Structure formats: structure tokens, C-alpha cells
Amino acid sequence: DPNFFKMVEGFFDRGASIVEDKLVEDLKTRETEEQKRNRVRGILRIIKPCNHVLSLSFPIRRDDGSWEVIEGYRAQHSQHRTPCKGGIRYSTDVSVDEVKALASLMTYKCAVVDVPFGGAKAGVKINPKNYTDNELEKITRRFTMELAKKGFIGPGVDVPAPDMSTGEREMSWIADTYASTIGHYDINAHACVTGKPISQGGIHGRISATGRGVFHGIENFINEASYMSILGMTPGFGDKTFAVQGFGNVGLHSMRYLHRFGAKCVAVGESDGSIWNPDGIDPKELEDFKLQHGTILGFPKAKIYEGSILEVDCDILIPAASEKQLTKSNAPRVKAKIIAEGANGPTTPEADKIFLERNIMVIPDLYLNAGGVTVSYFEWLKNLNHVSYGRLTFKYERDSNYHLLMSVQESLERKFGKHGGTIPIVPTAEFQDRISGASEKDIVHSGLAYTMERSARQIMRTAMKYNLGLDLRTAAYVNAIEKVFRVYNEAGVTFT
Template sequence: MKKATEYSLFNDVCSFVDDAAKHLEIHPGLLEQIKQCNSIYKFHFPLRNDDGTYETLTGYRIQHSHHKLPVKGGIRYSEFVDEEEVKGLAALMTYKCALVNIPFGGAKGGISINPLKYNVNQLERITRRYTAELIKKKFIGPAIDVPAPDYGTGAREMAWIVDTFEAFSPELINAKGCVTGKPLSQHGIEGRTEATGQGVFFGIREAVNVEDDMKALGLTKGLRGKKVIVQGLGNVGFYSAKYISEAGGKVIGVAEWNGGIWDESGINIEELKKYQIKNKGFKGYPKGEFIKNSKEILTYDCDILIPAALENQITIENAANIKAKIIGEAANGPVTQEAEKVLLEKGVMIIPDMYLNAGGVTVSYFEWLKNLSRVSFGKLEKRYDMEKYRKLLATIENATGEEFTEEERDALIRGASERDLVLSGLEETMVTAYQDMNRTRKEKGIESLRTAGFILALERIAISYMDLGIFP
């Protein structure tokens, strides 16, 4: 099944790069090198089904930029996977990593299947064969190319990938670092599951805390009371909505592929998620109004709209009807270039995907570092820190004659866990990157945060090439 239109995410990304390059003095040859995909691997392999029949599947792994190694990017299982989509997603990974200062080049992979049509045994055979094909061409490895989960894949598939890779490379001590997003039992990392959604929350929180920007949009500072619509209640959408709700935002609409829920009094995200898992959708949910044509919800009145599903969701066809003041691109490429021009003219703030969903790759970076060092974050220093804080509290109590309660004592001496350190690193990354991006936007006198993000990314990538002496 192919896309109904000739839309190209890769061409859109290249157009965004060209817009950003207008604000920089960059060698034309260098710009062309940065834009193009370095390596494209398309392959076919057979699947023997349980009934004895065969089918031929198509897989992709595309490495967009080798300015830094290894390259990094997820593996997607979807019937919409094709070369143009994977090229576009790989390119986005390059600029995303550069923007948030993660030392990876960009890559992406996928298999053109609907994973819902296959059982677990079939999916395992597909995943292991896909991995074997990557190994044969050296398109995977902790120093070469490090995949991760994406749409249609998760920790289970990553476990199959690392097991297959280790079987082919028994002598490689850092083999676990060939892929991230693994289960904890396979040397994954605490906090990876919610990382992208947590990053979306940190990014939106940082944006709405800039008082001048919110005043220009006619909004108050902060998340409290903001009306939010989320498209997609998968991993990213769920955690984005959950953390925003906990911070005082009010989720009033949730759209999924098979229907949506609208409730202006506010939606309990955890209750809705439990219902969705049990009933395979929102139909029959006792609270709020069920909206059969869920894409309509994107045009409903709200302060913040978070498309967290697939690309190409806000287009020239529906952009004029969008009422949100802020669009947070939790998905990859949900707003087309044509639609963005319409939205910017309307004064909408778009927090771009290349920044906002970088939480996944940021925590993947931490997991990769953990695998290379072969030690968990906090393992060496946690007990030392706890003992140090315990002695400090005792000194304070002796000096003041006052004693802390047991709860206060536990809170003050608790050492940082792996999850604490991971989320702290993620927050620092997202906060710093937004401030850099917003400052660049204002210094260049441009409206688009996306263009500002691409400017920063291009500058950093160009420096990498120039330091190698490849371009002047």
C-alpha cells in the first residue's frame, strides 16, 4: 500500500535546510553534501509463513550523514515505509542530533509491513533476518550504526536485534551498544520508555515559560490551565499528555486512527489509556464525546496542539482551520512546509519536531554510553553520596539542636538513581537546546523556530566538516 500523494518528507526537510542556509555563509558544495544521504541500503528478503506460503518483504536502512559516527535512528514497521519516507526521517535525525548536541550522525530504517498482520513468531523471524541483512553490509554496530525503536517497534524487537548481533559478533565486548531502547534485562536504561514524551513535556514547558513569547500569543506564562489536544496516544502521546496534565495543563481532546475523545472538562489520560488498551480504541468510553472522524479534532479550539502520530497530518488542506496558538511537533514531520507558512502567517508558534521529540535520541545516547562503559549510571557514587549527606545532616543537627523527621532525612540523603540522572540529563539537554534555538530566532529576526533550529544544526555540522579540512 503506497501513499496517496507524491508528498516527500525528504524534499520538505531539504527545503527547510535551504531556508536556514539563507541566513548563513556556507559553501554551496558543503551545503549539498550536508543535504544528501550518504548511504542508502534497500533490500528484499523472504518470509516463510506458518502455512508454508512465502512472501517477499522490503527493508531499508539509510545513513544520512557521516559527519559524526556512529549514526543513529529508529527502525519503523509500517506499510507506509518507503525510500522517500526513510530518507526524510534519516535527514531529520542528522539535524536533530546536531541541534541538541548529541554526537551522532543521522540514520533511519524500516520494513514495509503492517505489524498487526503478523504473529510474534513471524515478527521475530522478520526482525532477526532484517538484522542479519544489516550485519552483512556493516550497517549496524556500536561504532557504525545504532538503531532504536520507532513506529511499530519496541523493546521486544530491540532485544531480538541485539541477540542476533551478539550471535554474529561473540568477540565484541561492546556488542550491547549496537542498538538502544532495549529491555532493562538486556542492558537498557531506566527512563528510556518515557523519554520522548518526557522530552516533549520539557520542551513545551520551556516554551510556555518565556513570558514575552506567550504575551505575543495572547497566552499567560506557564502550563497551568492551558487547553491541550493530543493526536496519537501511543508511547509518545501518552507520556506527553500525562506529564502535561500533572503540571497543570488540561487535555481536552485525544485523537487516534480509529476515533477520538473530546471533553472540555478535561480527560484523565491514564484512565483513557487503560480503556484504549482493553478495548482497542476509544469507542464506548463513558466520559466525553466520541468523535468518529478523529482528524477533525485537530481543528478544535485549544491552546496547545500536539500531533504525536505520523508525518503529514497538518497540510495545506487543514492548516487554515487550526485554532491552536502553539503546535508541539511530537511526531516526525507532522506539519508540511506549505502548512507551516499558513500557520506562521496566522501567528501560530510551531515547536519543531527536530527539537521537541529529541528526548528519545538523547536518552538513547545515555544508554549507548552505559553500554560502552558497561556500568549503570549512579552505581559507583550513589552510596558514597548518601553517606556524605548523612554525615552532613548529622553535623547540622548537632549544630542546631534540631532533628529532621524521618521523611525529611530520607528525602535529603537519597542518592541519585539511574533514572534520576537520566531525566536530569534529558532536562538539561532540552532546556539548553530550546534557549539556544529561541535566542537564534530572535537574533536573526525570524518567526520560525524550525528555521532557527536548522540554522544552529547547519552551523554545527558545517564546523565538523570544516575541522576535517574537507571544505573551506
Template sequence: MATISLEQEINPWEAQAARFDFAARKLNLDEGLWRVLRYPSREIIVHFPVTMDDGRIEMFTGFRVLHSQARGPGKGGIRYTPEVTLDEVRALASWMTWKCAVVNIPFGGAKGGVICDPKKMSQGELERMTRRYTAEIIEFIGPEKDVPAPDVNTNEQVMAWIMDTYSMHMRQTVTSVVTGKPLNIGGSRGRREATGRGISVVCDEALKHLHIQREGCRVIIQGFGNVGSNAAKLMADKGYKIIGIAEYDGGLVNPNGIDVCALIDYRQRNGSVLGFKGAEAADPVEMLTQECEILIPAATENVITSRNAERIQARIVCEGANGPTTAVADEILADKRVFIIPDILANAGGVTASYFEWVQDRQGYFWKEDNVNEQLATILAESFDDVVRYSEAHDVNNRIAAYMLAIDRVAFTIKQRGIYA
């Protein structure tokens, strides 16, 4: 393995590109298609002013990257963080292309972001920034072009502002321009829990595949936001033992299992998991390397790297976050025979439910939550089987199998459509 710096190792675009290149090589992908699929088709950078509450005019920078529209409109979230970069958004857009193809839904990949700190902004400032960002990219988004969704530090309210801004410009209500909206303006039942539900489904499938009993299966979850908390609750209800929760401000551990519902209530009241009486405080960084059957990194990128991969003791790593494991760490975990459920499969419940919401908006007919959950479970279980079969047929790990399966599907579509030149 070539020696690289940690900075190179954790660069999300380089990580995505390395895995794409490896999978494309395994597929013997045509050189022309390789070039088409390796790079995004459109990258937008916008700089725009927003009037702050004190009358100051602040300049913000936003991004929207469209990786592919070969299989359908672009699809991908919008994140608001001080750390967002073009490389990160570019990588996430590419991952969305592969994620949609792995679960075989008719979208391509896209992603967006604005460099800001929403924790330091008022509701009014966030609304004005969101609307101006939407206006800056408005010609590039739409139900048949590119459909945004919530991501880090964005939510139903942000999606409502985007939908309203787009609708005002179109002079008609267009609910299908975004997903992850409030129910009363075209949102879907089950959407909020969908990513966590998808994680629980693929973990069930992994236990069956590896012949591990679910009852008492020990789980550690990094991140207790929407994804982590819903995964924890759904898995605890099924009999998994949630023994650890790692958050940015501290961790909790209880070998006998944490009462997840009580913890969710506690966090809603206190804004943090710290001080919860049903578990002992623990170092959140060290918790990643504690003994368990399933480790679920469900927070941010690059939490499993060359610096800690050797100490991972989990039998299964189920990637609730995008890009939590670096390519270098992948090789280490493969040597340790850790069964990885890669992000482009593990957290695809969110985009699958977003697809359901888009379909419902376009139909003007909305499904019952049981129907959403049933269809979601079916798609995720079938996709897990597809990836495992591909892995066994091509003698590669699950991540490379997922990439190969996705690239194969997108490349096949491009060949059918032909290259317009």
C-alpha cells in the first residue's frame, strides 16, 4: 500500500475517485465511459449577499454539483456547515449517483451546500440565506432536473423555504422540486425515519448472511441525530442491544443496553446526551474501537482511518454516514475480515423514501406509512442481496461490489442512450 498523508487519505473526492477507479478497472469499463462517469457533469459556485438582522450585508458561498442525469434527475441533499468544500460536495454528488443505482431508483447524483454556521444565525437570517441561495441556482434545479433534500444542518423547514422560493419564481406551486418537506406541503410519511429504518433492515440482512443471532447483538452507534437515533430506536425494538452512543460532545456506555426511548426524550429536553443517568460517560473517540457485533458510524466522514482501523473490534461496520471509512482503512478492515455494509447501500433508505415522496408529489396521491415502510424494506433487502451476490461472483469486498454494481447499471444506461456529441 502506497504511503499517503492523512490529508490525502481523508480528502472525500480522492477517496471516492480511488474506489471508482478500482471498481471500473475490475469491470473492464470502456475507457470513454470511464471518463464520462469519473467527473461531475456540472459544478456551480455562487457568491451571494444576505442582509443580517443587524443590517450588515454578509457574503455567502454556495455550491451545487450535478454528477449524473443518465438514469433520471439529479438527487441529493443540501448541507449548511462552516467546513463544506467543493471537493466534499463533488464527492457526495458522485456517491449519490452510485447510491441511487445500487437501490435501482431512477435518479442520478447531486449535492449542494453553503458555507455558514447555522448555529450562529437567527431563523430570519437562515430563511433569507436559503431563499437567496435557491434563487442563485434556480435554473439548475427542478422536478425533472435536480431535486434537493435535507442534509447536515438542514431540515423540513429549509426544504419548505426552497420549495416556496422555487414556486414563487414558477408562478405555481411545485411541491416535487424538493423532498424531505413537511407532511402538509407534500412530504411523505416515514421519510424522517427512513435512513435509520434502512440501516436496521440491512443490519437484519447482514445477521442472516453471517448466521448471527439478533437477540443480544451488541451495537455501538456514533452520532445520535436523526439517522442514529432512529436506527437505535428501531433496532432496540427488534431486540438489538444498544450498548454505546458516541456524540460530538461525549459518549455513553451501558453493557446491559441503553434505554433508547428514554435517551431520545432526555436529549430533546436537554439538547445533549451528557448527564443521562441510564449509562456511564465514555470517551466518544475510544468507543469506536470497543468490542461489539455492529458498529454504526452515523455522523460524519472520515471517522475510521489508518489511525484507528486496526483497533476496530466490530464484526460488522454499517455506514450510516456518507464516507465514514477511508480507502486506506478499508484495506485494514478487509485484512481483519470485518463485514462492511457500505454507505451507498447502508444509508440509502433516505434517498429511497425521497424517491417515494417525489413520486407521490407528482401523482398527487399519498401513501400510508405502512406502505412506505414495506416498500422501503423490500428495496433495501433486495439491494443487500444484489451487492452480496456481486461480491461473491467477482471476489471483491462489499464496497467494491456496490460500486461495480452501480457503475455497471449507470454505464449500461449511457450505452443504451448513446453519447450526444
């Protein structure tokens, strides 16, 4: 746990130095000096800092009747894209310099995965356990309100999302508040927030989103030996053990869908304990260990283990909990060989230099948990379209398929003069399930893969153009910076 603050500011500067030659060479203009350096040196000094960042403070009535002040923050990084976006967090750790960095990170995350959004982030310095459910509703509903009055919430202005100990039911309050007060007259009022439950205009598949993101991100890597020929290991994805931190939302489903494919587990940790089992624990059982009683503490197969969470002899480690759990106190340790950032910045630049020198591949959060916002993107789009995806183009498409297949049948039955034998009316077993169980989530799942997979091409191409090889982090930010630049370059200085 370092002070740092400038955690993300280092990576930008790192990626910034290398594109200083590309932008001056790719820009086609009539200025042609070396003040080209001076324009670009200026353009990057604008993207670095957050353009707006509102500090807040509002009172509420506890169930006592006692009165308490609540500090809250929200930072819009860039506004190159019309709507900023980023989750909101409820924890005592909440700091001003926190969201100022996190919102910055969200800008480049949206750039990597070609999501037309600006980076944003918020935070409330409370502790959610210490308040009731009735107490916590008034915090969110009024936090909503005090943000709409100053233009930090609304479709096309800013769209927040859930995060640390923030769930669907809370976003539902956000929506219900905005659609009943300020954004009343707005048709797309319910689009003010992504992550709301499905009866509230949500989308199928974001419950899983960060998980499949964790999954699809790892998938596009241990299926290409171009990075195993250096790291070692086996393209045989199966027999690989993993360990998660922070069993919650991102922690569950990064495991719920990682197990499915034959990849065993070995450990699970929360904010008090850990688990150790070389046989491989199964979320089949231990998932009814949440509110069934309360807090994890071991179970059948689940042994009580303490020391830390990383430590354990493993392959794939995912610190999907709080922030900066990896520093020099533990970077030369970690009996692992590939790390994947499920949470936002658990790896510090203090540790990358060590990992890089030990041939350990850390999957950057800037890429990995980008599925969450990519689907968030879709959820937003859903509310602007006011239709479940495929709600009109399923029967037309499944009827078009069934006519197409039979068309090859009958076309095969006149070259074959008896009409009755051939039968291609039946599609393959996988495809028959595709049009019988056709829903909205299938569109989302395929779009998530098409966005995720094509983004890994944008990295593993820009990494092999600069010999980064294993440092995909400095290969990620160097692609996002280039995408946000042209957005500023081709927009021109605005004289207002």
C-alpha cells in the first residue's frame, strides 16, 4: 500500500514518449516545422489532467435522527467523447486523487476497446456496512440529485456504473431518481446509468460481463504461442490453476466462467481470509456461502489458510479486489506465472519492473476488465433504442435460415430426380440451439467477443511494432493515447 497518487500518470508519460515520433510523421498538415513537437507536447498536456472534477458534501438523516455529513467526489477525465462514463464507489478509502486517477484510466480503457466514451469516476467516503438499506437509499438518491444540478449525471453528459460494493439495486435508485426529478422530460432518462436490473431497463449479460471479459481477455493469449514461446507454459488451456481475490461481482464470475472450461481453481481470498486446496475448489457449492450466513470462513474442502492470498503456488492470479496490492513487499514473491488485473490498478509500477525481469506476464486492467464498460456501452445503447436486441430480427432471421436450408434441399432434389431423399432441413446441433434459444444476451456475448478479440489484435500488432513483447501494459496505453489524440487533433482548439 504505497502513497503514490501518480500511479496512472507514470504509464501515460511512458507511452507518451514513444508516439512523439509517430504523430509528427502521421499528421499530414501544411505547418511542417518542429513546432509540430510543440503542438503535440501541448495536446498530450490536455489529455493528462481531468477537465472537470466536482467535490461534493451533503447531509442526510440517519435512522437515529442524528445528522452526518457525507463527502463525495466525481471526476470527468476527458470530454473528447460526448458522454463521460465510469463507476461510483462506496468506501472509506475514497480520496480525491483516487477518482482523479481512476477517471483518467477509464478514458483510455474506453479508447482501447473503441467505446465512444469519456473517462469518469466517482466516490463516496463512507462504509456501506455501517448503514442500513433504508439509510443507504437516501445517500444514493440524493447523491444522484446533487450531481444532476451540476451536470455530472445524464445521458450524453455522464453515465456512471456500479463498482465497489455498489450493486444493481443502487443503480436502480439512481435511475429512478433522475427519471422522476431532473431528467423527467428526457425520453432516454433511464439511460443515465448502466448496470441497473433487468426489470429497470437493463441488459442481459452484464451480470457476467466483467467475468467473460476476464475470460475472453485471457482466452486471446493462451491460444497463441507467440507469447508462450517466451513465457513457457502450455497452449493446452485446460490443466491450469487460478486464484481470485475479493469474492464479489467481478471475483465470482471471473471464476464462475473460468472454471466451466476445465481450468481448476486452488484458492480464494476475501477481506479476512483465504482458501487452500490443491484438488480444486468448485463454485458449485461455495457460492451459497454469501448471505446464506454472511462471511467466508472455510467449508467442506475449503481449508482455513492465512498468510496472504497471492503467495500460493499457482498459475493465473487475479487481484479483483481493492487497489495496489502489488508492490515491492510482494512482487519478488508470487509463485505465479501470469497475472490478470480484474480490479483497477492492483499492480504498481513499483512491481512491473520486477515482474518484467522475471518473465511474468501481467494482463493490464486497461484491457482486461474492459468488458464491463463495453457491455455497459451496449446497455446504454439499448435505452437509446428502447428495444431488447433482436426483438424484431429473430423470426425474420430464423425463418430466413429455414428457407435457405430447404432451398438447398429442393435444389439438390431436381439434379437427383426423386424428390424425397435428401434432408438438410436440420442444422448442426449447435446451430439448432442458436435459433431456438435466441435471445438478447447472445448478441451481447458475440459483440463482447468481437470487441475484445479485435482489440487484442490492436495491441499485439502495436506491441510487435515496438518490441514491447511481454510489456503489454506499455503496449496498451500507447494504443489508447493514439486514439484519443486524433479525436482532439481533428476537433481543433475551441475558441469560446
